[PDB]
Design a protein around this ligand. Sequence first.
Ligand SMILES: [Mg+2]
Ligand SMILES: [Mg+2]
Length: 958
Amino acid sequence: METYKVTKTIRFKLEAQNVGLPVAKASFNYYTINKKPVDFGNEKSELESRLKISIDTIFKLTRENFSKKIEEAITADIQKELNNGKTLLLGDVPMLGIENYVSLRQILKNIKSNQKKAFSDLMQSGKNYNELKATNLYLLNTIEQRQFDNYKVKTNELEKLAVKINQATNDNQKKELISNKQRVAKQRGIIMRDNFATWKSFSNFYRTISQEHGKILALLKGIEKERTESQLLKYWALILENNGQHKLILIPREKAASCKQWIASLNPSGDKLTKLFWFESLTYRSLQKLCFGFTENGNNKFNKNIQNLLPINGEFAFQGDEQKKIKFYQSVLESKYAQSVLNIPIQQVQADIINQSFASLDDFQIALEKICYRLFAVVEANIEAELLKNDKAQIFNITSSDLRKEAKDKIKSHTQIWKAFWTSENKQNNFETRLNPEITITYRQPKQSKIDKYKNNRYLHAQYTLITTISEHSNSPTKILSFMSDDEFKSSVDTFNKKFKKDEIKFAFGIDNGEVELSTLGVYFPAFDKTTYKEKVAELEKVNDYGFEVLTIRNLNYKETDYNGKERKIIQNPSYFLKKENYLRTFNKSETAYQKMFTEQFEKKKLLTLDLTTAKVICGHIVTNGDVPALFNLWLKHAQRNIFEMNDHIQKETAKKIVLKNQLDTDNEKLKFAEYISKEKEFGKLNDDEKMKYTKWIFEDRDQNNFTEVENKKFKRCQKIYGNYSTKAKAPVLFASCFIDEELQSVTDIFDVRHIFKKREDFYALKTEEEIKQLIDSYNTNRASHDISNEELDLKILNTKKALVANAVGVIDFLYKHYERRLGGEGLIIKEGFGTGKVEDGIEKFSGNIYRILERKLYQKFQNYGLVPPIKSLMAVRANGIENNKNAILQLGNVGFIDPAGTSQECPVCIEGRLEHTTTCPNKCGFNSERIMHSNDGIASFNIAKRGFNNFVKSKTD
RNA sequence: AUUUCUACUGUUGUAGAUGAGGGAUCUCGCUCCUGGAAGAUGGUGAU
RNA sequence: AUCACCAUCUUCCAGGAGCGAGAUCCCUCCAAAA
RNA sequence: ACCA
Ligand SMILES: [Mg+2]
Ligand SMILES: [Mg+2]
């Protein structure tokens, strides 16, 4: 479909020849080397109008509710300060320069601080409830005496603990500390955090005010920082091409004036295996700065002339008429003065801009940029030394790994673009791929943690890196988002959604997000929907013509020895067994050997679904088992974090102890865990005798026990973290228990239990069972959270969570291209709209959920094709899910969202039936998922796609 | 062994992904500095 | 036997700054002729 | 919707 301009930041390496922190920044265009700060006059005068507040309108900035007395008290407290003619602001901003101003955020902080100061003194000193009710602490007043006593019991207990600790000796001191920290201080803090209603409400109100202020604080901070970021340009840059390779020349502005003049006299003499390029261009965004930029001061010499062309002054004169603006700009280019100082190609502009007529301003911008962008070329004998002599030019070599290897046709995309920029054909499209006129250089020190311990390596020595920005699709409409109001982004999305047409779409992808399979994919086409069921079943059965072809590894332990005697395993890197050259080179085998190995090790089949947990693209084939290590790394990082966050990390020693286990031993531990898993309601109501049968139900094999209807009545309704915890489960679980007593006798105070790891089958192909030794070294009580630095422990889960998404986006894009080059039309990506309420629950249950990251990476992927609009504030548009509506659909470009109700069990053909088991509908229709889907778990994704398609077309009917 | 990340890894390096810099608000874990309160212990003064 | 004070010491609370993890968010990345 |  029709695209729009897109930007990316690509970088290379530089090798110095003649001479992180910004060592240098440069601009190819010679006329942006003396920049001046942007004209933000409007926004500065507009944001002050949002800062100012009128006292009486404060309480309507929040959803919270305060009684009238508290409202009056707060207003009185603020008025106490607003005397002497001060004016109130939503916050303090030293950059705008306001004075005699009073910050509301500071006052809200102070009235909270003073009261939390007085309340502690009152509670500590030993006053009474009636004394409290007579104080001026209007926030803490009116608490139930029950809470007051609940708090003072802990206070006095703590008091006791204090003097106990002072006269301490020996290991006793360790058992005291924990009892002081773990149970008393934390419980007391939570009591006041989550039970004092007015306190909670005021905390929420202050939070909302603080966030609101922070927004328009960040905006203004960026506005100010732009004023100083734009003074660091000093160099004019050139690219000297030779023998098919580029150099990089930086020349200071002290000499650019003479250097360009000298270069202008060079003779263009074809190709001699050496060229000295230099860029020139003008843009619409710069003409407005030229004409209506800083006009109020009157020193804009471009407005000492040209005024006759004006209607009165200032860009606001045009009132917003596109065709008056177009004509004024054409006249500006038509003026005698403008052509005397500008450097545009007068002939082509005159024959193609001034004389023409444009339908809209977008085309005027496109034509101006298209015709004003030039890439010159000159050549002369040994043209390197004159620069070093006359102009003191610094010189680097631009390089990278892909720019030095023998074979080509297999090269990284970010190098593909740079290779494609210089092609001759690209000069005849008017530079569709554009290299923007500003670039930067950075210098990185070596890692001492690598030097000391140490075989080529990046980090073993310093590096010079070049960062450049490249704009693809330079001849399509532009789109920018700075300073748009929140209500304009939604309108932008709605307008951009109009491009799609009802009969344009031809298929859809449905994606399901579980927790045993982190995600699942399925494909739907309109051809599946025949009239009779007998036709639907047959249409589905033709898997050979619809589904896609996938390879499955047959033996994950297979290994082979290469010529060096080293051994290699298939699981770690299958790409050394699928590609031909790699196998024949490394293992020195013959053609027949390769054919036999390929025919014996890998199975292949065509299906309608998949399982994105481990699928990967290897040498053009989709391997369903090509990415086990990336899943193991995630299931290991989750456990390593969990077993480190349940310790304690105070400086002073403590006796908290924790251990790993395969099963729980003492009934205290089982009773603690069962409580950790169940809902507080329907559990505390559970009889103290049945709390043992519940443990037997959770932790035994369920085969030798005669559990009655109680299981459905009670056990299955109070469980909120589902799973299988038996000893013979498919993926046996591995536990961590925490206590203090030395030997864990049958009567000990265990005060935490959790389930850490899942022993997924086929993890043993990488690591033996004993490699829980790895899961432990990352837990240690003595460690202080402040001390722990990177490169000795790593708690990050972001990278290991982006790895799986990186492997899944490849599969999804490959399938999208495959089907689009067969059906002739674009398709929709459908996933259910959980919103924000359920995303947090999903994170809680596992903490490695991939939903939001996968969505945020699909948006990044599919923008390049021009299929979703630019995104500014994602939470603005949705902020929530789609519930209780089985027809609605939320659309961002080609990415849809729907309600997930009743999708995971309905039969694709019979609808009314339910298909939780046997892979055949109980209604006895012809449906049978044996030869279609990888398992019975894919039926959700299919449905997720199905409902995604039918609804979308339904939206276009009117 | 990489502009950068992940799995490998040296007879041409291999398979997937890649928009980077600086900053704002909030939640959780910790440390140093200054101030307030409760209190343990040796000593000194006093009625 | 009681009351005031000096000094070492324990805990909790408030404010300032810094480190580690997660969530939401923002701006910059093309201008000038004497 | 997440799951012996
Ligand atoms: Mg689902
Ligand atoms: Mg699922």
